Amino acid sequence: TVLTPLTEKDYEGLKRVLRSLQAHKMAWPFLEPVDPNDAPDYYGVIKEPMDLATMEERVQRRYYEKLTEFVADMTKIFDNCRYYNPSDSPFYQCAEVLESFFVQKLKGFKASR
Numbered sequence: 001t002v003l004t005p006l007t008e009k010d011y012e013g014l015k016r017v018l019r020s021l022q023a024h025k026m027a028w029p030f031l032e033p034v035d036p037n038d039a040p041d042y043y044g045v046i047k048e049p050m051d052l053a054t055m056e057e058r059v060q061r062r063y064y065e066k067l068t069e070f071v072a073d074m075t076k077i078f079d080n081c082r083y084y085n086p087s088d089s090p091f092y093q094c095a096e097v098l099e100s101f102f103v104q105k106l107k108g109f110k111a112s113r
């Protein structure tokens with residue numbers, strides 16, 4: 001299912017999904033690693049940080065062998081955000097918006113495989 005090996009043509013689809021996420025108006029908090037100057041305790045709280053720039057590096061290097069691994073990294077971004085930030089924080093709302101967008105794009109990618 002979602003465990004099949006990613007082909008080179010799959011990787012063109014993954015690049016497009018990632019670029020759509022990076023261009024979303026609510027993606028700004030996720031574009032780069034969390035700066036500890038903006039959240040001093042963040043890296044003691046979150047033990048597996050993730051961000052869209054790290055995923056872009058991984059896509060360029062063909063890090064992902066299965067689509068599940070790509071979805072797992074994307075899910076970490078949103079899970080870390082909802083765990084670190086309170087439910088009324090604007091950051092929490094950004095994760096809400098961007099995760100539903102990612103699901104919309106992912107369904108598109110899967111249908112096109």
Ligand SMILES: C#CCNc1nccc(Nc2ccc3c(c2)N(C(=O)C2CC2)CCC3)n1
Nearest residue numbers: 028029030031032034038039081084085091
């Ligand atoms: C605006 C601005 C500063 N510049 C910048 N640039 C690019 C991304 C970015 N993310 C950012 C900024 C502040 C904070 C965060 C992230 N945290 C998050 O948990 C967000 C879910 C990722 C932790 C605490 C507060 N910040």
